[PDB]
Amino acid sequence: SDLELHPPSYPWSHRGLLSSLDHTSIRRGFQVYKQVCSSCHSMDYVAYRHLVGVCYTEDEAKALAEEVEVQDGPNEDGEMFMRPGKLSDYFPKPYPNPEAARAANNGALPPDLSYIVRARHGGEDYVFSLLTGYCEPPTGVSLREGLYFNPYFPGQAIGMAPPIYNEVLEFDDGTPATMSQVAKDVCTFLRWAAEPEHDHRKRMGLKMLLMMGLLLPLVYAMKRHKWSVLKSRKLAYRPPK
Amino acid sequence: TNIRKSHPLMKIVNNAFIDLPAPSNISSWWNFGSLLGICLILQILTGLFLAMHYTSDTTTAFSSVTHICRDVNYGWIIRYMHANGASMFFICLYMHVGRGLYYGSYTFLETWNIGVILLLTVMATAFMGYVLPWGQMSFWGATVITNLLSAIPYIGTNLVEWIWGGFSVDKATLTRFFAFHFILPFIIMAIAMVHLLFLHETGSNNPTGISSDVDKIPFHPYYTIKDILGALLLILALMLLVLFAPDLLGDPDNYTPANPLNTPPHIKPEWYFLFAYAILRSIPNKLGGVLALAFSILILALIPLLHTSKQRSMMFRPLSQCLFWALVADLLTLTWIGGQPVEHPYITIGQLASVLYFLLILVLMPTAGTIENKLLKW
Amino acid sequence: IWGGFSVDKATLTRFFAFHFILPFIIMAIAMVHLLFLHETGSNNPTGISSDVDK
Amino acid sequence: TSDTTTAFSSVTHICRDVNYGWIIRYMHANGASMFFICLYMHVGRGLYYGSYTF
Amino acid sequence: VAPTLTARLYSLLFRRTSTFALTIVVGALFFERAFDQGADAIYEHINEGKLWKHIKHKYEN
Amino acid sequence: GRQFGHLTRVRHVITYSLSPFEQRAFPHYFSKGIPNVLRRTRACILRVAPPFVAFYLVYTWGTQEFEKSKRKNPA
Amino acid sequence: SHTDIKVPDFSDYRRPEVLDSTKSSKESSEARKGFSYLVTATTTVGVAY
Amino acid sequence: ELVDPLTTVREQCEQLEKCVKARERLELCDERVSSRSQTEEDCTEELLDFLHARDHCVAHKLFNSLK
Ligand SMILES: CCCCCCCCCCCCCCCCCC(=O)OC[C@H](COP(=O)(O)OCCN)OC(=O)CCCCCCCCCCCCC
Ligand SMILES: CCCCCCCCCCCCCC(=O)OC[C@H](COP(=O)([O-])OCC[N+](C)(C)C)OC(=O)CCCCCCCCCCCCC
Ligand code: HEC
Numbered sequence: 001s002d003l004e005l006h007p008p009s010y011p012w013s014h015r016g017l018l019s020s021l022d023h024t025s026i027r028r029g030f031q032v033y034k035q036v037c038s039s040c041h042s043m044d045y046v047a048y049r050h051l052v053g054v055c056y057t058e059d060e061a062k063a064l065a066e067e068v069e070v071q072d073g074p075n076e077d078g079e080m081f082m083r084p085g086k087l088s089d090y091f092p093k094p095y096p097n098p099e100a101a102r103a104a105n106n107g108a109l110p111p112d113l114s115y116i117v118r119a120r121h122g123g124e125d126y127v128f129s130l131l132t133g134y135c136e137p138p139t140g141v142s143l144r145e146g147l148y149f150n151p152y153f154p155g156q157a158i159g160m161a162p163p164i165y166n167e168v169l170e171f172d173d174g175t176p177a178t179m180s181q182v183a184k185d186v187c188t189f190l191r192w193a194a195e196p197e198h199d200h201r202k203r204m205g206l207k208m209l210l211m212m213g214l215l216l217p218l219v220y221a222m223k224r225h226k227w228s229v230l231k232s233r234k235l236a237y238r239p240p241k
Numbered sequence: 242t243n244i245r246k247s248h249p250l251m252k253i254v255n256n257a258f259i260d261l262p263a264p265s266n267i268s269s270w271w272n273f274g275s276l277l278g279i280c281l282i283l284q285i286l287t288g289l290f291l292a293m294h295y296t297s298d299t300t301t302a303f304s305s306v307t308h309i310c311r312d313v314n315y316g317w318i319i320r321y322m323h324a325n326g327a328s329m330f331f332i333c334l335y336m337h338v339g340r341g342l343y344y345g346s347y348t349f350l351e352t353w354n355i356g357v358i359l360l361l362t363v364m365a366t367a368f369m370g371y372v373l374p375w376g377q378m379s380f381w382g383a384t385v386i387t388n389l390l391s392a393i394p395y396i397g398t399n400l401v402e403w404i405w406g407g408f409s410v411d412k413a414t415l416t417r418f419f420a421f422h423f424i425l426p427f428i429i430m431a432i433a434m435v436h437l438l439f440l441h442e443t444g445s446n447n448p449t450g451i452s453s454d455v456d457k458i459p460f461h462p463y464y465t466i467k468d469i470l471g472a473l474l475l476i477l478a479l480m481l482l483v484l485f486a487p488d489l490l491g492d493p494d495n496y497t498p499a500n501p502l503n504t505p506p507h508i509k510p511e512w513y514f515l516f517a518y519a520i521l522r523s524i525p526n527k528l529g530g531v532l533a534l535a536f537s538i539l540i541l542a543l544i545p546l547l548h549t550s551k552q553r554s555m556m557f558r559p560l561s562q563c564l565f566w567a568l569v570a571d572l573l574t575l576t577w578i579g580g581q582p583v584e585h586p587y588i589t590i591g592q593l594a595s596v597l598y599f600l601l602i603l604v605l606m607p608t609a610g611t612i613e614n615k616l617l618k619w
Numbered sequence: 620i621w622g623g624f625s626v627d628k629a630t631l632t633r634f635f636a637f638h639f640i641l642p643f644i645i646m647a648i649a650m651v652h653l654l655f656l657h658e659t660g661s662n663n664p665t666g667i668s669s670d671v672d673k
Numbered sequence: 674t675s676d677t678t679t680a681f682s683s684v685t686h687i688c689r690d691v692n693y694g695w696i697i698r699y700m701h702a703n704g705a706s707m708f709f710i711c712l713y714m715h716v717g718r719g720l721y722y723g724s725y726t727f
Numbered sequence: 728v729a730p731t732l733t734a735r736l737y738s739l740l741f742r743r744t745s746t747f748a749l750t751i752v753v754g755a756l757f758f759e760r761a762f763d764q765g766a767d768a769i770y771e772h773i774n775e776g777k778l779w780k781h782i783k784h785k786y787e788n
Numbered sequence: 789g790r791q792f793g794h795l796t797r798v799r800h801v802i803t804y805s806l807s808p809f810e811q812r813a814f815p816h817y818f819s820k821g822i823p824n825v826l827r828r829t830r831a832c833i834l835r836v837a838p839p840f841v842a843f844y845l846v847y848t849w850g851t852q853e854f855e856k857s858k859r860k861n862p863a
Numbered sequence: 864s865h866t867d868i869k870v871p872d873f874s875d876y877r878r879p880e881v882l883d884s885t886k887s888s889k890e891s892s893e894a895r896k897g898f899s900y901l902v903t904a905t906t907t908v909g910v911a912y
Numbered sequence: 913e914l915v916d917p918l919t920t921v922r923e924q925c926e927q928l929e930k931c932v933k934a935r936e937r938l939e940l941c942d943e944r945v946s947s948r949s950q951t952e953e954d955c956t957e958e959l960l961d962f963l964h965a966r967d968h969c970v971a972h973k974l975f976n977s978l979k
């Protein structure tokens with residue numbers, strides 16, 4: 001029941017009706033999730049194989065999967081064990097369950113990020129504004145320790161410390177890792193994470209518009225063709241007198 | 242003589258879609274009959290292809306839906322067709338019903354009352370479909386609505402706990418809703434055939450409300466091509482939502498798994514239930530809200546009994562036309578109020594619009610038809 | 620038909636969907652089964668027409 | 674439930690925990706057999722008595 | 728002037744219903760490739776440098 | 789059902805019809821069409837417009853009164 | 864009296880090839896039929912895709 | 913150490929007509945609540961109005977400098 005601040009509309013390059021994601025920004029955004037976000041936030045519905053042919057090669061994505069260890073088994077002795085990741089493994093969860101997560105984050109629960117852009121009003125506009133929107137509390141607002149003022153978060157008191165800042169990571173292609181850059185790239189990747197079908201539906205959408213622009217007037221013409229018998233018919237009444 | 246007329250199978254198709262005498266002047270508002278038939282078929286095909294991958298268990302109901310949109314080949318296009326097809330279903334239903342009020346088609350009692358049964362079973366179908374993905378709104382939408390049944394006197398809790406299979410919306414509630422969401426669309430299609438059985442006994446009404454037996458045309462080719470064109474516009478409207486805005490009509494909360502402990506801030510239905518959600522919350526009493534909520538749709542069965550005009554269609558009745566669009570705008574007000582929190586001044590507006598709804602249908606519109614009779618001196 | 624390379628998870632789920640849809644398709648065909656029957660009426664043990672005794 | 678991890682046990686859950694689930698299941702399994710008894714009598718009646726001429 | 732193209736299209740292809748169908752199924756074969764080829768060329772042009780097939784050459788080996 | 793030849797009784801009415809392959813499917817589409825659409829809207833605008841304008845006024849007021857009700861005052 | 868029944872004038876509706884009452888309609892029958900059937904063929908080619 | 917384009921263009925939005933008007937209404941609140949330290953009024957309302965006008969200008973110009 002607090003005051004609300006809605007996010008403005010940033011001109012993302014995938015905003016337009018026919019505009020695809022920027023796959024170089026996807027690539028950079030994955031690096032932000034891995035290096036910064038993955039230590040508190042799960043992404044239970046994205047696997048390394050989904051990256052192949054989107055932002056990494058198959059060989060690149062294989063090497064990326066092999067950089068982490070995941071549990072497998074049982075072996076013939078009934079024991080679980082660790083092996084290098086493969087393309088089919090989902091991204092490692094940072095906590096076994098939400099109760100462990102709350103204990104590690106002063107009682108707050110970092111949500112899964114697989115769908116975060118679709119599960120919050122304002123999508124990437126909201127996420128971009130939250131990460132880049134921290135500021136000092138207004139006069140008369142005193143938040144208890146553990147919580148952080150953020151005017152875009154409901155209630156204005158959020159349990160996540162500001163997670164990004166200048167030079168938080170280095171990009172593989174040399175892009176300056178400014179706070180706004182990091183926010184922009186991670187938001188683009190999260191859009192892809194929540195809607196991997198994004199680019200393909202717009203390609204389909206274009207074909208649907210073109211086919212409709214052809215088929216609608218032709219079918220209309222067929223309707224008028226048949227109906228012309230009726231639309232130009234003339235009547236006359238000749239009763240006996 | 243003619244194979245199309247004498248064969249036991251083709252004569253039913255012939256006397257329904259080919260040689261049926263139809264009025265020469267039925268307008269675009271008569272296209273929604275076939276479009277509802279297409280939506281029902283379209284929802285069954287996509288619905289079936291989703292059932293080849295969906296599982297009706299809480300531990301995997303949410304993720305099986307995720308599994309479709311990500312891993313299954315063209316699963317994402319099949320799902321959003323199903324979710325948006327339901328909305329197109331309700332667009333057509335409301336045009337279909339509004340056409341019947343304006344033009345007087347409700348005078349076909351058997352056709353109309355079976356239509357009311359079709360509206361109720363389609364609403365019950367979509368209500369149970371929204372539970373299956375098991376998101377936040379899926380759970381809490383099911384909770385607030387099913388809890389209304391506890392307000393029935395002396396059998397409330399026993400009836401609610403029987404529909405739940407326990408003490409709340411839980412595993413047993415999710416599974417049976419899938420079974421009921423599966424069986425009902427076929428029961429709907431059978432009732433839609435009886436809906437046509439009673440219709441063909443009389444033929445279609447027309448915009449004037451005057452009999453068209455003096456001027457009939459065969460349904461083929463004139464209305465086969467007109468329904469095909471109308472169906473093509475339906476696919477345009479559907480695919481624009483599927484391929485450019487598949488999340489416009491849906492709520493973001495449903496992209497979060499169910500949580501019996503954490504409640505979302507604003508629990509709002511889909512757009513095609515907001516008008517009835519507003520009527521529910523505008524009544525303070527609980528049992529009174531259920532009766533008004535059920536009377537909001539069952540009132541349609543009373544329209545034939547409340548017809549006072551010597552004329553059938555509103556085409557020649559200006560004073561009734563104004564009250565008709567007052568009913569639409571008042572329903573567009575309840576829709577708007579339904580998607581807003583229960584706070585000042587929306588509380589008062591929702592109560593005024595709720596009374597105006599039942600006052601327009603029960604009192605004002607019948608009175609206008611009588612005034613219109615006097616002005617014409619009969 | 621399998622949805623893979625053997626009888627697996629995808630095969631089990633679609634069989635449930637097909638096992639659900641078919642009995643209603645069956646019942647509709649059983650109505651057409653009666654439509655063609657009533658066009659002639661029933662046979663009888665003798666194979667002789669029974670129009671003289673119905 | 675139509676998932677391998679619970680398809681077998683959901684059937685077990687019916688015969689044990691669900692009220693009169695065991696009577697509903699065996700009716701379904703044996704009803705299928707009665708279905709095929711009747712189908713084979715129904716077809717055999719048609720061969721013997723010549724009903725296939727329809 | 729010889730008869731118009733639509734006149735020679737009728738007598739040669741559309742008069743018989745069988746050739747009318749053969750015209751359509753053959754016209755559907757070439758239309759699909761020509762439309763998919765052209766339509767994809769419009770989608771990629773509007774999204775130049777953003778799709779994976781544009782940045783593919785950078786990670787060859 | 790109802791069949792042609794059993795519908796009703798008509799007398800002394802002649803109907804002239806042209807084949808669709810000898811007439812235009814869009815005869816004077818913009819010449820006569822646009823004047824007829826203005827006529828059709830003008831003849832019904834006073835029946836349909838007021839209630840949706842009345843909604844637009846209630847929609848605008850109620851949304852303004854809603855925001856200004858939660859904003860603080862010097863009290 | 865039925866000899867008084869003249870057919871009304873459809874000049875506002877006739878296609879350009881059918882305006883002259885002194886020219887045979889066979890000269891344009893193939894072109895007129897070809898156009899409306901080309902519309903039908905192209906429509907089926909679209910739905911087929 | 914680095915030049916974040918956010919903070920640089922933020923200062924370009926702050927020096928606009930509609931933004932400075934919202935700042936002094938907040939500074940008037942910063943002076944109102946600090947004076948009498950016996951109340952529970954907060955200046956959240958005057959801040960979000962300033963952020964609403966500022967960040968609207970930020971979104972229009974920010975993405976031209978990033979990759
Ligand atoms: C219960 C569910 C509630 C859900 C709320 C949904 C939000 C509603 C959004 C409003 C959209 C409005 C649709 C467009 C209306 C166009 C009307 C029109 O063009 O003009 C009036 C027309 C006049 O035509 P006549 O036949 O009288 O004479 C013609 C001679 N040339 O007269 C007609 O053509 C009118 C025919 C009837 C149209 C039906 C539309 C209303 C839909 C909801 C009705 C629900 C009833 C319970
Ligand atoms: C297993 C693999 C099998 C693959 C087989 C592929 C075959 C593809 C189609 C080819 C068949 C053509 C048949 C034909 O051509 O004969 C249909 C009819 C004729 O046309 P006509 O009247 O000009 O007479 C024609 C007069 N002549 C012949 C003298 C010019 O065509 C029409 O009329 C109807 C056309 C309208 C199209 C829309 C119908 C679809 C339903 C609605 C869609 C939208 C919502 C679902
Ligand atoms: C621990 C050091 C974290 C890091 C690193 C990241 N996040 Fe986080 N996040 C964390 C907590 C404890 C919470 C819960 C806050 C609460 O009060 O509930 C969150 C929450 C989020 C959210 C959800 C906001 C909402 O509207 O509910 C988002 C969108 C989010 N966090 C984003 C995010 C991103 C993009 C990160 C990498 C740059 C990231 N977080 C890192 C804890 C931690």
Ligand code: HEM
Pocket residue numbers: 270271272273274275277278281334337338341346347349352353355356357359360363429433436440444445446447541
């Ligand atoms: C699954 C739901 C439904 C389907 C598929 C359906 C289908 C149809 C069809 C095809 C027609 C004939 C064509 C037409 O008039 O457009 C028709 C007519 C009609 N329907 Fe429905 N209908 C449904 C529900 C309803 C409802 C909810 C109502 C009203 C409460 C209703 C009332 C009528 C009436 C009165 C007619 C006759 C209209 C006339 O002759 O002018 N139907 N319906």
Ligand code: HEM
Pocket residue numbers: 281284285287288289290291292295306320323324327330363366367370371372373374422423426429
């Ligand atoms: C009148 C017909 C139908 C209507 C109106 C309807 C409506 C809906 C709606 C609105 C949803 C919610 C979808 C979402 O939010 O993602 C849904 C879910 C679902 N429906 Fe239907 N449906 C119909 C027919 C069917 C049929 C016949 C089947 C099975 C054969 C089916 C299977 C499903 C499944 C599996 C889901 C869950 C998957 C999902 O959420 O996308 N539906 N239904």
Ligand code: HEM
Pocket residue numbers: 645649652656660661662663712715716719724725727
């Ligand atoms: C779901 C499956 C079926 C149902 C519900 C069904 C039902 C019926 C019913 C009620 C009758 C009329 C009463 C009677 O003759 O006993 C009948 C007659 C008949 N059925 Fe079926 N039937 C089915 C399948 C079959 C099959 C598999 C065959 C043969 C391959 C068949 C062939 C016939 C014939 C020839 C008759 C006419 C018998 C006569 O008039 O003497 N039916 N069926």
Ligand SMILES: CO/C=C(/C(=O)OC)c1ccccc1Oc1cc(Oc2ccccc2C#N)ncn1
Pocket residue numbers: 364367368369371372378379381382383385386508509510511514515517518534535537538
């Ligand atoms: C399971 O909840 C489904 C919902 C939905 O909108 O599904 C399409 C829903 C979501 C949030 C809140 C409530 C919800 O369900 C409903 C259901 C509903 O059903 C009716 C519709 C018309 C008339 C009466 C009723 C009732 N009862 N009227 C309003 N909201």
